[PDB]
């Protein structure tokens, strides 16, 4: 037996679950992009939501979830040092 549990992984092994994102979408709509948000590969501007997450070590991180037509139809970034950094998608 396996259990589906896809996730996006930010630094410090900070996982944002794909399943939790789907639940969130049922009750919150994506909002207009804010200036400086990552664009698409041909300059597309994507709707998104952003939120704060407390990490295992007690620090906080700002996470951006964009809605787009690329599989798996969401992508995630964390605000860094120094600009946005991708939180790659993983399917265990």
UniProtKB/TrEMBL annotation:
Question: Disulphide bridges in this chain?
Answer: 10-87
Q: Which keywords does this Swiss-Prot/TrEMBL entry list?
A: Signal
Keyword Signal attributed: yes
The lineage's top-level taxon is Eukaryota
For the keyword Signal, the answer is yes
- From the Swiss-Prot or TrEMBL record, give the protein name: Uncharacterized protein
Q: Where does this protein come from, organism-wise?
A: Blumeria hordei (Barley powdery mildew)
Please name the taxonomic classification of the source: Eukaryota, Fungi, Dikarya, Ascomycota, Pezizomycotina
